Design an enzyme around this catalytic site. Structure first.
Site, PDB file in Angstrom:
ATOM      1  N   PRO A  55       0.824  -1.213   0.000  1.00 33.07           N
ATOM      2  CA  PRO A  55       0.000   0.000   0.000  1.00 33.07           C
ATOM      3  C   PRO A  55       0.856   1.260   0.000  1.00 33.07           C
ATOM      4  O   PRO A  55       1.948   1.254   0.567  1.00 33.07           O
ATOM      5  CB  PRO A  55      -0.771  -0.099   1.321  1.00 33.07           C
ATOM      6  CG  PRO A  55      -0.742  -1.548   1.681  1.00 33.07           C
ATOM      7  CD  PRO A  55       0.573  -2.053   1.184  1.00 33.07           C
ATOM      8  N   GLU A  56       0.357   2.320  -0.630  1.00 34.90           N
ATOM      9  CA  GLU A  56       1.036   3.612  -0.636  1.00 34.90           C
ATOM     10  C   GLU A  56       0.508   4.476   0.511  1.00 34.90           C
ATOM     11  O   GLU A  56      -0.506   4.143   1.126  1.00 34.90           O
ATOM     12  CB  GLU A  56       0.821   4.312  -1.980  1.00 34.90           C
ATOM     13  CG  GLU A  56       2.064   5.007  -2.512  1.00 34.90           C
ATOM     14  CD  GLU A  56       3.204   4.043  -2.777  1.00 34.90           C
ATOM     15  OE1 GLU A  56       4.300   4.257  -2.227  1.00 34.90           O
ATOM     16  OE2 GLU A  56       3.003   3.067  -3.525  1.00 34.90           O
ATOM     17  N   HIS A  88      -2.451 -17.390   4.456  1.00 35.51           N
ATOM     18  CA  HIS A  88      -1.338 -16.471   4.661  1.00 35.51           C
ATOM     19  C   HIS A  88      -1.568 -15.509   5.830  1.00 35.51           C
ATOM     20  O   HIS A  88      -1.177 -14.345   5.765  1.00 35.51           O
ATOM     21  CB  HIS A  88      -1.037 -15.695   3.376  1.00 35.51           C
ATOM     22  CG  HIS A  88      -1.009 -16.559   2.155  1.00 35.51           C
ATOM     23  ND1 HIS A  88      -1.906 -16.412   1.117  1.00 35.51           N
ATOM     24  CD2 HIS A  88      -0.212 -17.600   1.819  1.00 35.51           C
ATOM     25  CE1 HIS A  88      -1.652 -17.318   0.189  1.00 35.51           C
ATOM     26  NE2 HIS A  88      -0.629 -18.051   0.591  1.00 35.51           N
TER      27      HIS A  88
END
Ligand SMILES: [Zn+2]
Length: 251
Positions: free
Chosen positions: A1-2, A92
């Site tokens: 993510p930014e 995961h």
DNA sequence: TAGACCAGGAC
DNA sequence: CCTGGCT
């Protein structure tokens, strides 16, 4: 993510965990835990603490508890969800914080690149990985003056300067390219070659670009016509990264 | 300061 | 080979 996505995560995750007390911490991939090095110590110290807040520093999330801060970097694929202890974990899932109310904060990360550091709150800002992090792009601490001062001290490219976490916090590749485009500056320009008016324009576009995303001209558009002049956007390599720019609009 | 390094597996 | 952030 930014950065803007991390801010969105910060904003929406907070209500979902605030005031909850940790009853257990389960770790299925210890390498994610970076401090304390021993993941059992990491797990033992969190038990019994209540979540009091959640802040963001660059792309790092800072979970604030009673005594400790949990510093979390998602890197590529890291993600958080809140769900019931009664439901099976999704694939995961590598770290789970169990709360006394039967809900859980789950950390999933296919890449297993994300990291977690826990320290007493008062020292998190002076320890890795936060220790050297630069000012928030949207804060007054990041000003044209500050950018200018770093600019005229280096020999490297303006893009490389902007990618430097010590200069400004969490300014991603995408936003570097977009901001440079909007400021009309070639990513390859030496930082020192920039004029007072240029650094000022750059700062303004940096703030506007990241600010708008929080609340595309070139990135990934190579081969495609520039949206302002129609010139084909180009892609090369600058400072390790793929770099996108308009040869006409940017000088 | 320029790469090298690295988390882990993917095709 | 993808990517942010020690020599
Ligand atoms: Zn153009």
């Amino acid at each position: 993510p930014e950065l803007p996505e991390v801010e969105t995560i910060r904003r929406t995750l907070l209500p979902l965990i605030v005031g909850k007390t940790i009853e257990d911490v389960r770790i299925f991939w210890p390498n994610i835990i970076r401090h304390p090095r021993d993941s059992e110590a990491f797990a033992a110290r969190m038990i019994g603490q209540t979540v009091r807040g959640l802040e963001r520093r660059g792309k790092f999330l800072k979970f604030l508890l009673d005594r400790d801060a949990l510093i979390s970097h998602l890197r590529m694929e890291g993600r958080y969800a809140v769900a019931s202890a009664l439901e099976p974990l999704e694939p995961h899932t590598h770290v789970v914080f169990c709360f006394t109310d039967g809900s859980e904060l789950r950390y999933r990360d296919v890449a297993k690149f994300g990291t977690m550091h826990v320290y007493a709150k008062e020292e998190a800002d002076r320890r890795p990985p936060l220790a050297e992090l630069g000012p928030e792009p949207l804060s007054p601490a990041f000003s044209p003056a500050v950018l200018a001062e770093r600019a005229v001290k280096t020999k490297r490219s303006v893009k490389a300067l902007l990618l430097d976490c010590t200069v400004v916090a969490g300014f991603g590749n995408i936003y570097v390219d977009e901001s440079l485009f909007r400021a009309g500056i070639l990513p390859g320009r030496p930082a020192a070659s920039l004029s007072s008016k240029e650094i000022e324009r750059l700062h303004e576009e940096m703030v506007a670009t990241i600010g708008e995303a929080v609340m595309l001209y070139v990135y990934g558009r190579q081969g495609n016509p520039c949206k302002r002049c129609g010139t084909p956007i180009e892609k090369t390599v600058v400072a390790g990264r793929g770099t996108h720019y308009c040869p006409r609009c940017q000088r």
